[PDB]
Design an enzyme around this catalytic site. Structure first.
Site: not given
Ligand SMILES: O=C(O)c1ccc2cc1OCCOCCNc1ccn3ncc-2c3n1
Ligand code: NA
Ligand code: NA
Length: 358
Positions: A44, A159
């Protein structure tokens, strides 16, 4: 305002990739006015908005593509950001604050309070000249504090990397270095926040096999031995090295080479981790398979030295950073330092009372 909020918020369409067609001056929810572009991706777009229901305060707004796999991943991210906001209602623990979320004609939208540059972008704009030790120390302390709180709430980020750690404000001063005979940017405020919870996993949930970005990925992930909170501790030790030197500890893109570099820098992998892995092809009579004489062997021999060799100074505060980084980089995740233990490490005796007290 080139545009009116009611009119703009109802005038809407998608492109063939399922992005929202939008430009600066458009509105969402009769509330958010787009004033800048911040990022695009397979997921997006990210725009800077003024929030007109909160005094035109600045937000980063993620606008997820109208595509089921992205919509569903965003829905899982929102459920994690909700659980974190619920456990830290007063934001003491330095995670990005989700201010709002909504479904805009099939687009999941997620608003965050606008922050400054990430810690990689700042380093890059300083010509990869490293952060001074006091800045490494304050950033290390904030990372330990932030992830200790997630870990004690049964969550692993998975992460962590310099791009996901954002300065509250990245304004700098330009100091001249006597030793480098050339100028350095020094951030005026080292306050940081941890972003990007789209991969964060609770203890009870299904654990994806391969997590973390290559440079920040621990040996238990590479060898597929199972992972948990200690995965984040390894990533933090790699991040601290990178703040301190300005280059990555593990400059590799292949698993066998990565494990060899870990041995050159950190010492031998524990024999029980080698015995348990499915990846037996990496090993022969219990040792890593590696040609010291190939072009990669010559590169690794010249470039990958014992961790302590990377110290820039040999004062005690440098010794203490290196001891803490060695404990974060323990091969065996069960012997790796916990972030509750890291917060008691003597490295953090060097913090000012202001840095320590937040
Ligand atoms: O995923 C998060 O948790 C996330 C949290 C906060 C921000 C962005 C995020 O993701 C989108 C990253 O791409 C845009 C990069 N630029 C900027 C610039 C300024 N800010 N202030 C907050 C964020 C931000 N991002
Ligand atoms: Na519109
Ligand atoms: Na977890």
């Amino acid at each position: 305002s080139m545009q009116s909020s009611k009119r703009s918020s109802r005038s809407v369409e998608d492109d063939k990739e399922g992005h929202l067609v939008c430009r600066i001056g458009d509105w969402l929810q009769e509330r958010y006015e787009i004033v800048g572009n911040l990022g695009e991706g397979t997921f997006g777009k990210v725009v800077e908005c003024l929030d007109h229901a909160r005094g035109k305060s600045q937000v980063a707004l993620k606008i997820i593509r109208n595509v089921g796999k992205y919509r569903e991943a965003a829905r899982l991210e929102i459920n994690v950001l909700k659980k974190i906001k619920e456990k830290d209602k007063e934001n003491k623990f330095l995670c990005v604050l989700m201010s709002d979320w909504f479904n805009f004609h099939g687009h999941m939208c997620i608003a965050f309070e606008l922050l400054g540059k990430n810690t990689f972008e700042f380093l890059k704009e300083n010509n990869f000249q490293p952060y001074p030790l006091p800045h490494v120390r304050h950033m290390a302390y904030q990372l330990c504090h932030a992830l200790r709180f997630l870990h004690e709430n049964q969550l692993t980020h998975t992460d962590l990397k310099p791009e996901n750690i954002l300065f509250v404000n990245s304004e700098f001063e330009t100091l001249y270095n006597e030793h480098k005979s050339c100028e350095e940017k020094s951030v005026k405020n080292t306050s940081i926040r941890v972003a990007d919870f789209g991969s964060a996993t609770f203890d009870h949930e299904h654990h994806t096999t391969i997590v973390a970005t290559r440079h920040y990925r621990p040996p238990e992930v590479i060898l597929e031995l199972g992972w948990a909170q200690p995965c984040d501790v390894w990533s933090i030790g790699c991040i601290l090295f990178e703040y301190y030197r300005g280059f990555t500890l593990f400059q590799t893109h292949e698993n066998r080479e990565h494990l060899v570099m870990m041995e050159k820098i950190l010492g031998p992998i524990p024999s029980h981790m080698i015995h348990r892995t499915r990846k037996q092809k990496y090993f022969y009579k219990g040792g890593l398979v590696w040609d010291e004489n190939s072009s990669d062997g010559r590169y690794v021999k010249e470039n990958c030295k014992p961790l302590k060799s990377y110290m820039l100074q040999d004062s005690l505060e440098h010794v203490q950073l290196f001891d803490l980084m060695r404990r974060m980089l323990e091969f065996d995740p069960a012997q790796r330092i916990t972030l509750a233990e890291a917060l008691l490490h003597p490295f953090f005796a060097g913090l000012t009372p202001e840095e320590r007290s937040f």
